[PDB]
Amino acid sequence: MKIDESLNVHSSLLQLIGNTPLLELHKITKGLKGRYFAKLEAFNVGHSAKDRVAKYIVEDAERKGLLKPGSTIVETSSGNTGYSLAMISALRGYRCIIAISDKSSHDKVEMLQALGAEVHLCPANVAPDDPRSYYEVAKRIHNETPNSIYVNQYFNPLNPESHYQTGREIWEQTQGEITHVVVCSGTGGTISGIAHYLKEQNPRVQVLGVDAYGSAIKKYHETREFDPAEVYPYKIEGIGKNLIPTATDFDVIDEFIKVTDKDAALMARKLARTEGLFMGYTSGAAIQAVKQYAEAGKFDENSIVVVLFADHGSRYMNKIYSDDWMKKQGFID
Amino acid sequence: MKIDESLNVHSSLLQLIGNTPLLELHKITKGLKGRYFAKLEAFNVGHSAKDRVAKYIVEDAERKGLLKPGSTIVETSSGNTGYSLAMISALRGYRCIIAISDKSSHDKVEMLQALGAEVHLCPANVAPDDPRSYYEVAKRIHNETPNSIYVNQYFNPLNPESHYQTGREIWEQTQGEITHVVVCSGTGGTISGIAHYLKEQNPRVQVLGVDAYGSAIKKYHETREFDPAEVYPYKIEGIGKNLIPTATDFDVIDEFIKVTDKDAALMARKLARTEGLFMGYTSGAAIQAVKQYAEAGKFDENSIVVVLFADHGSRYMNKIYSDDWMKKQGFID
């Protein structure tokens, strides 16, 4: 017997990454102009878009001889990148060490540990250069650990490179008809890699980012200056940042918009109840951003709008899908 | 622009059900004879094999005129079937009412509510005919509710019928070479529908079921008598039963084997750490059963063994992937 990929038969979990569904939306986008499609990155085996980053960077390190059974992968992550790296590390027999901040719910920490990762919990509300931060904890661990790599997704050019293929998929799945893409920006690797592919096929495609309140990204996109007044703690994970990642290519992004923690959380809940799509916090942010962009007039009857849904609702049971947590934030009565 | 299914472009979430991956395993099955493949039903949009049941029964009811926007779908479920029905009910605008027993962790209840389902929590340790049970609570709600259906998966012949296609996939994905299939049996719909397709193509295919300690299924399979001594509370959800479902076709199942709550939980954890496959409690049971069947001599160097992995690890964060819960059961020190 042999292994056929159109029979959906696979020799490695790594082949269950990429080529995710594009699904047309009709209900959550009711009464907007144009057609709307969701790129469902939760269908990756690791349940987020970060599977592509982890695969691409691990395979690159393997090709460079830097990883063998027993080697160590170190990374700073709020959850998804660490999960994908720990998933691959479990398969390959790598030691995986993740620095995570306590902004993330304990659910994500226990997922990482189920995959066999060593987790270092770090205080969230410290400066990036504070030696207690999850950025600096991971750099130390890397320096102290021989036969280790530091993925460093915020400053690793392989990150947006891995999402060139995401853009290729979006381009082919819309048959070259896409006019706008809406993508939340964390490291910025997803939006930038997508933008690189799409702008090369058609520079008129509008690349629209989503930012959080409390993040420096939008202001930097408009002024190219890091404004500390823009930075303060917020509750959405995986969107926005308290520093400027070089993984973000600000020159290919046409516009940024901010969405509140509250509206993103309510929109994630509304998406689940309306479309049956049980998606993560940033998917709620992304759909809310589509609503805000639409009210600002970005789309017309000829628009072909793709919105990236980065991860799955099952990782947010102690946040936006917990009525107690929502009440405690004041997002619901 | 048009919608192409090999571009993975879809007009409805319902098309993201079925045609799941078959993945060859090399590490968890190290040193067993033959080749081993996992059928990954967690890749359904609803993250379990029950997506197929829900789709098939809803579409059948729609074809029969029994469901329109505002109609009500009632079901008895421990989690997965209710999730899939609530997911579809959210999309279609049906009211979804689920009777669930408090054997299920509160995680599953909150997932159901995120999809907009009305949940009735029921005491677990009551007889099936006790009016407090989740079987009888759902039948009452159905009788009290006009424009409602009662899915009744334990006694609904559409249940194993929906898994005829699962068997067809397994048959094509192994190119007709499968010699054994290992499937946990709850309602029995999955194993029976799979067995119906496979035995019709090749009656020599061995259909091997997995049962829990505390369930009547294995004894009934061997004696065709319901033995109450076989029934007592246990911790694995979605395998075994305290009654005899007619959804189980005992005549196509070659053998049953029991796995302990402890070994299934440890094997789920070992599967995650070894293969990076983060799967549910019954996947741990299924892999443990493969180990037990292998030690009993069921497989040789020419065996082509498919093991069904029914759902995803992310639904078991408060059980087998919680070190506290495992310590409390005595499964780990």
Swiss-Prot record, chains A, B:
It is an enzyme of class 2 (transferase). The modification N6-(pyridoxal phosphate)lysine is found at residue 50. Pfam families: PALP. Optimum pH is 9.5. CDD domains: CBS_like. Its EC number is 2.5.1.76. Keywords: Lipid biosynthesis, Lipid metabolism, Pyridoxal phosphate, Transferase. Its cofactor is pyridoxal 5'-phosphate. Pathway: Lipid metabolism. InterPro entries: Cys_Synth/Cystath_Beta-Synth, TrpB-like_PALP, TrpB-like_PALP_sf. The keyword Lipid biosynthesis applies. It catalyses: O-phospho-L-serine + sulfite + H(+) = L-cysteate + phosphate. One of its GO terms (biological process) is alpha-amino acid metabolic process. Pyridoxal 5'-phosphate binds at residues 80, 186-190, 282. Transferase involved in the biosynthesis of capnine, a sulfonolipid present in the outer membrane of gliding Bacteroidetes and essential for gliding motility. Catalyzes the formation of cysteate from O-phospho-L-serine and sulfite. Belongs to the cysteine synthase/cystathionine beta-synthase family. This is Cysteate synthase. It comes from Capnocytophaga ochracea (strain ATCC 27872 / DSM 7271 / CCUG 9716 / JCM 12966 / NCTC 12371 / SS31 / VPI 2845). The lineage of its organism: Bacteria, Pseudomonadati, Bacteroidota, Flavobacteriia, Flavobacteriales. The gene is capA.
